[PDB]
Amino acid sequence: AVKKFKPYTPSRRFMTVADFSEITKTEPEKSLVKPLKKTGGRNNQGRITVRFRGGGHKRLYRIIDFKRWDKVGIPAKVAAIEYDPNRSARIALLHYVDGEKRYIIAPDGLQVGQQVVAGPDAPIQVGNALPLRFIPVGTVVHAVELEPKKGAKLARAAGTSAQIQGREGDYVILRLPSGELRKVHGECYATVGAVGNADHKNIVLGKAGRSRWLGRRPHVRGAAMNPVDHPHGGGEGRAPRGRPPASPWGWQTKGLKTRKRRKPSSRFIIAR
Amino acid sequence: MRRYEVNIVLNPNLDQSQLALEKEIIQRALENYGARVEKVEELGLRRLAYPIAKDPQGYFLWYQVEMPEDRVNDLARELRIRDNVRRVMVVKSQEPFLANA
Amino acid sequence: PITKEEKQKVIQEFARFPGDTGSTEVQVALLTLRINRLSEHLKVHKKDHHSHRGLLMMVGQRRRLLRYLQREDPERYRALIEKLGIRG
Amino acid sequence: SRKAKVKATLGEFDLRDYRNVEVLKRFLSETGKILPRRRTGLSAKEQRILAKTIKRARILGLLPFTEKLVRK
Amino acid sequence: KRQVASGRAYIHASYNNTIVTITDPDGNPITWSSGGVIGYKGSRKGTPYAAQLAALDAAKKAMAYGMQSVDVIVRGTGAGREQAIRALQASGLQVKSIVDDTPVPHNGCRPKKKFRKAS
RNA sequence: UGAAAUGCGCAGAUACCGGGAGGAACGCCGAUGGCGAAGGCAGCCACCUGGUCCACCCGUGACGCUGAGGCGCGAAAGCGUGGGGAGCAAACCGGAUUAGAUACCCGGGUAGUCCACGCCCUAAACGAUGCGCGCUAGGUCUCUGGGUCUCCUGGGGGCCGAAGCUA
RNA sequence: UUUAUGCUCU
Ligand SMILES: [Mg+2]
Ligand SMILES: [Mg+2]
Ligand SMILES: [Mg+2]
Ligand SMILES: [Mg+2]
Ligand SMILES: [Mg+2]
Ligand SMILES: [Mg+2]
Ligand SMILES: [Mg+2]
Ligand SMILES: [Mg+2]
Ligand SMILES: [Mg+2]
Ligand SMILES: [Mg+2]
Ligand SMILES: [Mg+2]
Ligand SMILES: [Mg+2]
Ligand SMILES: [Mg+2]
Ligand SMILES: [Mg+2]
Ligand SMILES: [Mg+2]
Ligand SMILES: [Mg+2]
Ligand SMILES: [Mg+2]
Ligand SMILES: [Mg+2]
Ligand SMILES: [Mg+2]
Ligand SMILES: [Mg+2]
Ligand SMILES: [Mg+2]
Ligand SMILES: [Mg+2]
Ligand SMILES: [Mg+2]
Ligand SMILES: [Mg+2]
Ligand SMILES: [Mg+2]
Ligand SMILES: [Mg+2]
Ligand SMILES: [Mg+2]
Ligand SMILES: [Mg+2]
Ligand SMILES: [Mg+2]
Ligand SMILES: [Mg+2]
Ligand SMILES: [Mg+2]
Ligand SMILES: [Mg+2]
Ligand SMILES: [Mg+2]
Ligand SMILES: [Mg+2]
Ligand SMILES: [Mg+2]
Ligand SMILES: [Mg+2]
Ligand SMILES: [Mg+2]
Ligand SMILES: [Mg+2]
Ligand SMILES: [Mg+2]
Ligand SMILES: [Mg+2]
Ligand SMILES: [Mg+2]
Ligand SMILES: [Mg+2]
Ligand SMILES: [Mg+2]
Ligand SMILES: [Mg+2]
Ligand SMILES: [Mg+2]
Ligand SMILES: [Mg+2]
Ligand SMILES: [Mg+2]
Ligand SMILES: [Mg+2]
């Protein structure tokens, strides 16, 4: 669910928080397998290269396991489900029979205390990782690799997933969370199930400050600027765009496509 | 527990060796969900009225069983996981209804 | 469903005497069994209103009896309830 | 108009067994439809039992769902 | 791009027109015609005579690539059906069979207001 | 289509074949039938579950009937949050018709139609016939139980009708 | 597939 508040202040009236009942003995995280210190910095070497960032709560980085072939065959028990501030999804601490501990992005359903495993073997149930080629066509899946052995990249956002649609050569055909139909190599690992914490999309920040906590500084409209600053600056009492709506740097921002045309990747795609 | 007849249609192009492979998992899954077999009728290949999986023919299997009813649904889901298992119809057993007699 | 010996168990346990297969309590108790069953079914299948209808009927019936019993014998009313956990 | 009611065309059959085609495939038409009561000679109760099973067989792949009208 | 003896004939018969495509044994159309190809516009094409004229222009072009036998297949009601079936037989092409494959849903998509009427 | 026009099509359409995607509805059976208190319920399978009838005459011993309030359910449309969207289709655009045509016919087409959850509480929600019980000729058709299985008996669904009722 | 309409009191 999602937590609501009686309006005992404005903003608290619309404010809505995440449900943390799914969260098992978190609080203190697992200092070992993560965390590392997280270098919080809003610009590159010198200059701001992404506007409107900075501030917001300090964070410890949980170094999660986005490649599971690392431990083929070795099963493991799910010890806890934890809060991770560095992603929308929740994380699951799992103890391997090895005695090795690793975090995984907690899939929807994944219960505390169940066994998990990865490999060409691997029962087709929730939490288990397999090379795409060995997953029954039609199953939903998450944390997919885009190229073999390069680590998961796709469907890692809270509530996201991907469907295996068919096979074609050493490639299988996924339908990515974006809706794009893509061919991915069969050797690429995926893990069965959707991501979970899917109520995520339904929280309401409620106030300006709430955005400040997440590290988002106020965003100012070109419309409020001067010509020096933005295509939309200037006028003299409000103003339509007076030209095709543009970004501070001049390019159009309503329709104009941006994907590089001649791109090797193009040969493996087929949708929106 | 209840008596269910269990119909399973398999890929016809499988070889006698594979066919046994696909048939051992059935039998284990059958046992893992709590089914105690009774009869059995492996009519084998059979001509189909319409192509299932683009294959005019299909290899048939038929089991009578007594399993806990609260696990029949799950069983069917499991039996179907195989690609060489192209259809399953679990049906609760019935005393035959006769005519002309 | 409530199986034969399953309901038999109850019949015997409440019978006012070996042979009693439909006294006030044996009925009340009997109903109580189905009610608690359905009540747990509806908790799961809540958009199943038709079945909930019967529930009301089984509940209403049970009440009528208990009102009769508490009218004729205010003793085995406490007794019956206490033993069943009813009237909240 | 003519022909027999069919029920009087075969001996003692189990119209609950959805597996024996030959008995059943005679209750279908040229095109493949379930035959009306006025040609199966079955009763109210028997016609339901029949269809219910005729459907099952179809799913199984034994009985057809439809077939073309031959030589019109 | 070839000359094949054994073939297959298709009759599409709608209220508004009749169109006949003649295919190879595999279904690949060898040549086709319709009420409009004959020379008619408007509703003249929905005629049984337009269907006849049509099915002949079909067969005639078929025999060009060497067409002898067909397995005539009709789809859809309409005034084209029979006259189109007849016409074929009455010129070269021996009709090895006459199948009716007019597609019908087991209650699939809702139809247009026009073809629904009752409930 | 009445006839057409808009529309689509030599940028390869319609017709035909093979592959794939996706949504919705379930042909024959099917009935003038069945079930439900009503709204209403129709491919198949399994699980959970309500009502109901019959046979036996076994148990309680009037424990009944109705029911102002209350509570629950309540077609379609409609509303909120998500999803879903193939066909259809208010609105809207275009083509025709006409004196005009914001319609009727045609080509497009968005909400909606579908799912989850939560609201809305309407209706020719109709048998325009509140519920329970006893009493007052029969004929025939049908569904479904039991029968000493031509006939009898119980519960339903129809028609014709004694007596009586009715403008 | 083209039509709509018929003043007031008797
Ligand atoms: Mg720099
Ligand atoms: Mg530096
Ligand atoms: Mg520097
Ligand atoms: Mg958001
Ligand atoms: Mg702003
Ligand atoms: Mg300014
Ligand atoms: Mg400056
Ligand atoms: Mg400028
Ligand atoms: Mg400007
Ligand atoms: Mg101004
Ligand atoms: Mg026409
Ligand atoms: Mg076809
Ligand atoms: Mg053109
Ligand atoms: Mg044009
Ligand atoms: Mg060209
Ligand atoms: Mg096609
Ligand atoms: Mg009824
Ligand atoms: Mg009705
Ligand atoms: Mg029942
Ligand atoms: Mg007695
Ligand atoms: Mg006594
Ligand atoms: Mg009052
Ligand atoms: Mg309510
Ligand atoms: Mg409603
Ligand atoms: Mg509605
Ligand atoms: Mg809506
Ligand atoms: Mg919506
Ligand atoms: Mg218009
Ligand atoms: Mg106009
Ligand atoms: Mg004028
Ligand atoms: Mg008019
Ligand atoms: Mg229209
Ligand atoms: Mg349309
Ligand atoms: Mg609105
Ligand atoms: Mg009311
Ligand atoms: Mg009504
Ligand atoms: Mg009135
Ligand atoms: Mg009445
Ligand atoms: Mg009343
Ligand atoms: Mg009955
Ligand atoms: Mg009988
Ligand atoms: Mg009667
Ligand atoms: Mg009458
Ligand atoms: Mg009279
Ligand atoms: Mg006037
Ligand atoms: Mg007048
Ligand atoms: Mg006037
Ligand atoms: Mg006057």
Which CATH number does the domain housing residue D18 bear?
4.10.640.10
Q: Which fold has domain C1-87?
A: Helix Hairpins (1.10.287)
| E71: closest CA of chain D, how far (Å) | 10
Cα–Cα distances in angstroms (integers) from residue A84 to residues B16, B50, D4, in the given order: 52, 53, 76
* Residue D38 CA to ligand 17 centre (angstroms): 26
- Cα–ligand 48 centroid distance for C24 (angstroms): 85
For residue D43, give the ligand nearest its CA: 41
CB-to-strand F under 7 Å, chain C 23-82 = 23-24, 26-27, 34, 37-38, 41, 44-55, 57-58, 64-65, 67-68, 72
D7 contact B CB<8A:
yes
CATH code at position E26 = 3.30.420.80
* Residue C63 CA, nucleotide F135 C1', distance (Å): 34
Q: Provide the domain limits for residue D10.
A: 3-72
Q: Where are the domains of chain C?
A: 1-87
Total structural domains in chain D? Answer: 1
In whole angstroms, give the CA distance from residue E56 to residue B77: 56
Residue E19 phi, psi dihedral angles, 5° rounding = -130, 135
Q: Which among A109, A117, A118 is positioned nearest to A140, based on CA atoms?
A: A109
Name the nucleotide with the smallest C1'–CA separation from D44. F143
In three state form, how does the secondary structure of E14-62 look? Answer: CCCCEEEEEECCCCCEEEEEEHHHHCCCCCHHHCHHHHHHHHHHHHHHH
Q: Minimal Cα–Cα distance from B63 to chain D, Å?
A: 13
Chain D adjacent subunits, 3+ CB pairs under 8 A: B, E
* d(CA B52, ligand 46 centre) in Å: 75
Q: Are A94 and A67 in contact (CB under 8 A)?
A: no
What's the domain range around E73? 1-119
Resolution rounded to one decimal, in angstroms: 3.1
Residues of chain E in contact with residue D70, where contact means CB-CB under 8 angstroms, are: 97, 99
**CB C55 within 8 Å of CB C3:** no
C-beta of residue C35 within 8 angstroms of C-beta of residue C11: no
| Nucleotide with smallest C1' distance to residue E21 CA | F15
Instruction: Residue B68: count other Cβ atoms within 10 Å of its Cβ.
Output: 12
User: Which pairing describes strands A189-192 and A140-142: parallel, antiparallel, or unpaired?
Assistant: antiparallel
Let me know: does E72 contact E9? Beta carbons within 8 Å: yes
Tokens of A79: 């010890």
Q: Do D68 and E98 touch (CB under 8 A)?
A: no
The widest CA-to-CA distance across chain B, in whole angstroms, is 44
- In whole angstroms, give the CA distance from residue A189 to residue A265: 19
Q: Do D72 and E100 touch (CB under 8 A)?
A: yes
- With CA atoms as reference, report the closest residue to A22 among A114, A110, A145, A101: A110
Which chain D residue's Cα is nearest to E82? D72
Q: Tokens 């057993």 map to which residue?
A: B93
Cα separation, D71 vs D55, in Å, equals: 27
Q: Which of residues 17-76 of B touch A (CB under 8 A)?
A: none
Q: Which of D31, D15, D19, D16 is nearest to D59 (CA)?
A: D19
Experimental method: X-ray
Domains of chain B, residue spans: 1-97
Count the domains in chain E: 1
Given the candidates 3.40.50.300, 3.30.70.60, 3.30.465.10, 3.40.630.10, the CATH classification of the domain at B1-97 is: 3.30.70.60
Of chain D residues 29-68, which have a CB less than 8 A from chain E? Answer: 65, 68
Residue D8 touches chain E, beta carbons under 8 Å: no
Classified as helix, coil or strand, A164 is strand
Contact assignment for D13 to B100 by CB distance below 8 Å: yes
